Symmetry: D2
Subunit: 305 residues, 4 copies
């Protein structure tokens, strides 16, 4: 198996707090927050650790929040490589409401990155050995032009770095601009936005995914379909894998868990079918903070029936 790294341009120190009620106008008294590592590539790395593998998380860190984010990851035994940033690591807020048992997630943009920090992030990435896998996951923070994302991925690819991309909107297009991307995991929304047309017909998602493979923009496209699972596309195969008929308790961390699972499968040179199954297994395991090894194992064995 090859080495795995992730990149999170917009990391977060996520604070989880509780309040009895949610209602407008008044003050909602919240408990003192419990902190946790936030960000796409970061969660992908944590999911990989849950699933037994190892992934180095690359990201910018600033202020005492950044230091706290780095310290959480140390406690969870996830390797990191950071560049210090001027703007302090931002905080997303997850609020649990007692009276309903429900969660609310307020996701702000990440901290800003100036030209210089991005170049430091690029230097760190180009340190990755050839053949190794890099998962670029999450949104694009303020201060980064889309052309700079494209240049990073080209640069990485020019020296044998295998690139996996999970992102949104123009950031996704910027990633696929150069092409030869190893793996992309848009959900439905991200797919419709990337292709710029509504996906209203039964075969629309498949045709759109197949187009991306055929145009060479990506070697593999896995479209995640929430409860319906995921549809995966090669130059060779096309496959849909549906999760077990089991009730979902939350949505949090499904995408990143799936991406981590599929990354571990890609690194192991598994078949397209193995990869999507393991991805759906981990994605759905997370819906039962992320995916556990035993839950993923159970679901993967069932799909592998």
């Amino acid at each position: 198996m090859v080495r795995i790294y992730t990149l999170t341009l917009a990391p977060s120190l996520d604070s989880a707090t509780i309040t009895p009620q949610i209602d407008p106008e008044g003050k909602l008294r919240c408990t003192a927050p419990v902190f946790e590592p936030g960000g796409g590539g970061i969660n992908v790395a944590r999911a990989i650790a849950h699933l037994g593998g190892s992934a180095t998380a690359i990201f910018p860190a600033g202020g005492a929040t950044g230091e706290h984010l780095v310290s959480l990851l140390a406690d969870e035994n996830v390797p990191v490589a950071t560049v210090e940033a001027k703007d302090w690591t931002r905080q997303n807020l997850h609020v649990h409401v007692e009276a309903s048992g429900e969660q609310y997630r307020f996701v702000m943009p990440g901290a800003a990155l100036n030209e210089d920090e991005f170049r430091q992030l690029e230097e760190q990435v180009l340190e990755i050995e050839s053949g190794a896998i890099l998962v670029i996951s999450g949104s694009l923070p303020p201060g980064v032009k889309l052309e700079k994302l494209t240049q990073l991925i080209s640069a990485a690819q020019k020296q044998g770095i295998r690139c996996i991309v999970d992102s949104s909107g123009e950031a996704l297009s910027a990633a696929l601009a150069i092409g030869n991307i190893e793996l992309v995991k848009p959900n439905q929304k991200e797919l419709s936005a990337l292709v710029n047309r509504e996906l209203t017909q039964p075969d629309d998602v498949r045709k759109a995914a197949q187009e991306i493979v055929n145009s060479g923009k990506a070697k593999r496209v896995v479209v995640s379909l929430g409860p319906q699972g995921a549809l995966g596309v090669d130059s060779e195969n096309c496959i849909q894998v549906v999760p077990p008929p089991v009730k979902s308790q939350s949505t949090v961390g499904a995408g990143d868990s799936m991406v981590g699972a599929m990354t571990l499968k890609l690194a192991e040179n598994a078949s397209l079918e193995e990869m999507v199954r393991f991805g759906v297994a981990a994605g759905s395991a997370a819906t039962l903070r992320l995916c556990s090894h035993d839950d993923t194992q159970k679901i993967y064995a069932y799909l592998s029936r």
Copy 2:
């Protein structure tokens, strides 16, 4: 093709209205109601009509609301057979909230049936010829014992009427009490209650469905799974059908549409696979717009599922 009848012991004259915002305390000013046919078996009969089929809807009807329910179905070319009830046909409320674009459905019990009005309904049911299909769908209204429902199904079965059941709670249990139902469509919640245990493992739903078949309660169990489609089970077969990757705009009224589709397939003696696929096609067709499934959407999805 055999004849198809549906039974709705608790029909409804539902009102669809629009209000700008939803919030407690204040008066929520609602637009003039737009009336629509309500009830399980009624909507199964409406879906069958849309799918180019035909089914006679048997239901009680009382008062000006009863008359408007009947007249609504007349305008839809849905054949009916009604019994006049003393208590007025009830009205559930469907509220569209402009601000969020959301819909709320407030579902109240059906009007009461006295024992005479029930007797007339069973009499209409027992006029159905042997070999024809009867779909019993929806909740049980006040004034009817559970035993009355079981006795009705036993009597109909005794004269060769093939029964399809869609219900919940204690009513679903009692429909399955004497067994030999042709087809039941529980969702995940209804299957769990029916079998009286948690379905949390990957293979539980399938096993729960098979258990109902092996016990003789039903020849066919199709567990509907919302966006995950459906898991259909036979004495010989088991198939899951997943709908196409198209997002849904609503959930009303997907269960009834599916049941309408599968009843039609049953009337055609189609294989289990075709029944379930056509079920998912119609159900998912109904989710495509915020009343039921249409012929063309269903055909489109079914052809995709059959490819």
Copy 3:
């Protein structure tokens, strides 16, 4: 004291039901409804009965719902005079949500009235003896043109019937069109709509109310101000009465209770001050289905300190 009658052009059989949760999309299973008399003039009459007086409620009734509405009022010992209508008496739905303890009120328009029923309603009103008081309260149902409301009030007034009006929007203007109205109780919204300008300045409400008295459109204008009470205006006096600093548990039935109280005071030829105080007392008592005699008494004694 003179005799009191009310008129409700848009009556309602209100059904109150309970559900554990309120949420979009799914089916909200509601208990079998508990029915209660709905409509402005109807509630005004019930409030008058609670406060010891007697008021005859005039309204159209149709279908089994109308019959049920009539039967509820019989049980509460409120006199009625009905005309039978073709369109069945409509049902507004009040939903109590267990998980929050909150109420939601869905108010549809009343049943339609054709030309003929309205004339029957007019005939019933013109049967009222001269000098007696008629409270016209509530919204205008489908099938009634605003000119017909105006004609009814003129007709009533032409033969000594004392008219009190509580309504909304154009219906309110239609009422004041003829002028010499005994008493109007707009709230803030209704006042701003009646006068057609935003009431943004401190003295705006008073000036607007005073204008109506001075123009002769109404002998008395009481603007209700929710928790701030009510501001009442004569040709002579101008007075604001504020409720006791007591927490409010619900809003339901505040306006109608206030109007009933003030009607009883008007019938007793009380001063403007007595009238508004008793109105605020009953209005606020209701916020603690309507106003109780003891609660109103308590608050009225406090205001009368």
Copy 4:
């Protein structure tokens, strides 16, 4: 006019953001935060500035967030006196929901203060000269004993600093423990808890307020009543002031504005009536827009109340 100082043991760097809709489960995408000064005594000092007065805000500040809180107040010409804390200044979240136009405020505890950082804050407080006014407003942060707050008020009083208190829970009780507070502004909830009983009768709030005065805990009790205005109580007087019949757009941050107004009146030795009227004027001025009271709106309302 004497000098005015405020104390905020739990200041905040609050972020105001906008999201289209609010609902559980999904990610609620929020716009880039817009930062604003948070904290009781800070906002009292900001309101005083708006009202054309001057007050020095004493508070702890840590990290880049602390620096931005300080810089925000600099841009507002609010004099400050800060103590550097180790733990970073916290951030509450204010969320504007476009769909409904509503605002949600998620209010978390202030950053911790160690005993040394508290010592420095008291040292800054005790540099205030006799006869000057100190407003202690807001919650108590972690790491501070209730006794530390009481000792601070006793020490300040001992050297002639006139103290105004706005707080809640156990902190408010302890501020009133040694008595002789110049002015406390509880709302209805805070008054009820403070006196530890239900205020349900018409005359209860007034009696509760008078009880606090007669006990010596405070010379002036002004109970704020939301839209009903305020009930101010003295050893000699009692006055309720109701705001004008103008609807409010927000409730943020009406309490602090009122306190700022009344502090200014106290510094002018105005009668109780003028203090309360000016209090309601500023408080209600702040409710006129969705940050605090403005000079012109306050003047307008006060002139109306004084007519």
